[PDB]
């Protein structure tokens, strides 16, 4: 027996940072959850009880706090690249740093039409995330994403024409609820290192906003032939809007809302064109995935 | 041994209802989770195996769907009163109906500055709830609430002057983060029955909006001496704004964000006036409650 | 406006305690989550910003750790009474202490037929809880409970004879799955104070074990006419077995497992006597409650 | 733009199956949650709105129920291989089926020392899982696992000798609590198809039991130099015990339990050799991973 792969570090490190403008008196808060895992020459810590190779997970935690102290935490793609670069430069035997970041919403409150200088509201469980792999010799791989974006449309969604055989009971439809929690990931072209990540900084926030925007507009406007067909159009657009992205990936649950037949009761009419009252279903759910790259 | 109290029914009934305007083409969706429990002359179902007294929980579920079909589901205080009244009028041996409703956010999407006719976004995990107790002979008791309203302010919160003794380690402060998940309940004056609940319908949505509004403004503007002092001012205002409310109750966790001392590292300065980076704490948390009524 | 009720304290305080026998070398661990809320003369902290009346929630937390250090943490009814008594004796203006405790399972591991001296396994998410209200002048009220005890029987459960009307679609049955998560609470006769709670210590662990035992045996052996009928027999027995209990309360979800009709497929036979494959339902669920006291 | 990868199917399909012995009168229940995703020639459903290529997720759900009806559901490695093989044989354009299965514990109850014929208890949230990839032309890849196995030892764990630098604050120790939730995956040698999976059936249950056994014994007996060192010995043993396994992978959180210093209070002694009372920490946690293969 031998160690084929190994990684270790600190998960679930919650970090909050405040920015205080002295001019405006305006405060901006950033909250995130950070995971850093390291790889490198650390087999002996497993095979020989040699702790001498271990940057302790506690230190990794200390380091996240220190790096957040000395650097901007925004955009997360940058903070993650700084944090991961720190570890492979600092430690000779550490050859890869994987950093994962979840950003939590703290939206400035509007009190009486005006932006409050220092109060915020978690206006959704939507997250913005990054996965940053900083690998000695191979640059910086970044996947950014939004997740937990939950939407529904009450009509303009259809599903007909699908395979029918002796396993099929589903009826074709031309009018249905479509509801999903959107998970969208866009993978950046590999960057050569931190200087190159710094050089693209403005693209991160912007591409995020664009992926959100496009996601929301296509979902609302597409008269959807299927989840498959709708997510492809989203991914197609993000790719067209940002040349530094190599692939867009979507993962979409189909959260079913079933018609409830009420005709057994006083011939009550609640199906088809008469459907007003539905039973949202907790499970099962369709799960539909697509990776879209450049042709 | 004897039955001192008994109640039974259906919990976690998820209900979605769409309203379709033919004029505008505009759709409005309502999603909620409903719980109905009944009391009455049902001891024998427990003591004697006499199922003859049981309106089956499955039927209760059917009834929720039927009532949502025939009536408005909005405001929840009304839907709950209709649903609970239905059971005590329908069944001679059923003397109390308790209805609980959680309303889930489906906010109309804005696509390109304009309200989309049929697409929605779950723009927060904030809930609006009601508890409705419909009791034969005693009218209708209604408690409405908002919960899951998560907010933070980065400054303008203080906590000093508290008792100090040999259990105390906490340092007084004049500048701190205050963060909480707001739970606010307002209890209506007892209503004589459905006609009276119908007669106050416009007050429900409005008092809800007012409780949200006041909650948000006081949190943002109060320079808070304590959570205790801040929630009292909220409750005081809701009571002043709506005469049909007998009591306002608040339940506020204090979600602590700890300073991280970084001076052990290169004399890094991250405490007091220098605090930029904090560790949000998952637990423990202060829990602070207040019921405010009329003097 | 005035303060009608107020309570404040520390929730979600996780506590672990190890007992080390020097004789045997045997270790015993206890893990729990503790909530303490205080009431008393604390209105001014709300109405006047007077923090002088506040035992800080941070201190309450310190105190839980100190009391766990100086006293046994087992049985929880005792630890809770000590902790709550501490607060009303220590502080003149504090007149009620409410202590809630959740005990988490750490079951000694069996390695090769033998009890391991210092390794444990969380062998279930079942909890043992107490609620202790220590009120100046009124003694100590204790409710103990078990919760999260999830069970299923594949047969010997029935449900027929229930009310049928134009809301009913449910078919009577003589053979069904019954599954539930058991919540059982037994309320002790009021105790005059700590000395009296100390005097009954051996009854706490024993009555707990008896409530678990009885719950499990009745569920397995009763050929159940209904959840209602089954839980009453459980409660009836606990009351008979322990004279110091005034009431037993049960709260039982009915977690439905639906037959799946497969006859549309090659006339596959999966209903009634042929039912092998079922669809466990996440929601809705029947919820059934009973409080049983002495006749 | 083009589709680089695509998969779609049904997630969260809950399935229960009862086995009824007529001889013994003994019932055995199996509950699981199943996910099936398909790949193949389905790009057009995304790019062209061509639903003609879609085996509807609803049908996939129907099929899971049908296959559970006609086949054993145990061991999960077999059921998963049957289910995935079904899809690639049934449908010409479907070239890969991925099946994921979570098995939930339903442990036969012991009533009065004897195994009850038809009552069960969810005696832990521990899961047994499989991931089965059935790929046209490439056989059947199976990864089996156990997860959610939560354990603690109060002593016989150490952590000293680790790297120290200006990011380090952690103190070396020779006595600590070690607690983790075990995730252990063993990957089988690729099988040529269903006949070959059928031919190894008895190895599945047995290797599972062995991985559980070894996990528990090593955790309890190893005087652990580090999580790293402890998990390697587990993985080393599983590999030695079962020749059909190519790799064992472990993923172990380190759930920290912090000493609480109580000497500020009446010089109370609760650290080092005196530590009795600890604060279990919800987050952050060390996360430690290892893949072990054959040298
Ligand atoms: O077992 C451990 N391994 C580690 O890598 C580590 N880092 N801090 N504590 C630790 N404990
Ligand atoms: O045991 C039951 N009690 C009930 O009240 C009920 N209603 N539907 N199924 C039921 N089962
Ligand atoms: O607002 C607060 N109220 C309290 O009672 C308290 N106790 N510690 N910190 C606190 N903050
Ligand atoms: O959009 C959909 N795609 C699918 O593949 C499917 N299967 N059932 N319903 C469905 N809806």
Tab-separated table of N, CA, C and O and ligand atoms in Angstrom, chain A residues 8 54 56-58, chain D residues 159 170 176 226-228 254, ligand 1:
chain	number	residue	atom	x	y	z
A	8	UNK	N	-5.109	18.238	2.907
A	8	UNK	CA	-5.547	18.440	4.303
A	8	UNK	C	-5.580	19.991	4.473
A	8	UNK	O	-4.965	20.729	3.677
A	54	UNK	N	3.674	18.989	8.266
A	54	UNK	CA	2.326	19.545	8.415
A	54	UNK	C	2.334	21.035	8.830
A	54	UNK	O	2.796	21.377	9.922
A	56	UNK	N	0.083	23.196	10.364
A	56	UNK	CA	-1.107	22.759	11.123
A	56	UNK	C	-2.377	23.467	10.609
A	56	UNK	O	-2.299	24.609	10.112
A	57	UNK	N	-3.509	22.734	10.592
A	57	UNK	CA	-4.742	23.311	10.068
A	57	UNK	C	-5.079	24.617	10.856
A	57	UNK	O	-5.512	25.642	10.266
A	58	UNK	N	-4.806	24.590	12.163
A	58	UNK	CA	-4.924	25.810	12.980
A	58	UNK	C	-4.150	26.997	12.407
A	58	UNK	O	-4.643	28.109	12.386
D	159	UNK	N	-0.933	15.438	19.143
D	159	UNK	CA	-0.506	16.133	17.967
D	159	UNK	C	0.638	17.053	18.300
D	159	UNK	O	0.435	18.171	18.821
D	170	UNK	N	-0.681	27.292	17.627
D	170	UNK	CA	-1.208	26.074	18.222
D	170	UNK	C	-0.124	25.459	19.101
D	170	UNK	O	1.054	25.382	18.711
D	176	UNK	N	-5.303	14.599	23.853
D	176	UNK	CA	-6.430	15.440	23.328
D	176	UNK	C	-7.565	14.534	22.993
D	176	UNK	O	-7.392	13.293	22.897
D	226	UNK	N	-1.739	11.748	14.767
D	226	UNK	CA	-2.373	12.722	13.902
D	226	UNK	C	-3.535	11.983	13.278
D	226	UNK	O	-3.532	10.771	13.154
D	227	UNK	N	-4.562	12.708	12.906
D	227	UNK	CA	-5.605	12.163	12.005
D	227	UNK	C	-5.010	11.496	10.771
D	227	UNK	O	-5.424	10.372	10.468
D	228	UNK	N	-4.102	12.191	10.052
D	228	UNK	CA	-3.368	11.638	8.876
D	228	UNK	C	-2.845	10.183	9.111
D	228	UNK	O	-3.083	9.242	8.282
D	254	UNK	N	-11.716	17.062	11.534
D	254	UNK	CA	-11.278	17.068	12.882
D	254	UNK	C	-12.204	18.011	13.618
D	254	UNK	O	-12.080	19.184	13.456
E	1	LIG	O1	-4.475	15.512	13.514
E	1	LIG	C1	-4.277	16.704	13.219
E	1	LIG	N1	-3.771	16.967	11.963
E	1	LIG	C2	-3.499	18.215	11.523
E	1	LIG	O2	-3.039	18.416	10.368
E	1	LIG	C3	-3.773	19.345	12.467
E	1	LIG	N2	-3.635	20.717	12.359
E	1	LIG	N3	-4.072	21.183	13.592
E	1	LIG	N4	-4.510	20.107	14.470
E	1	LIG	C4	-4.311	18.987	13.747
E	1	LIG	N5	-4.562	17.691	14.129
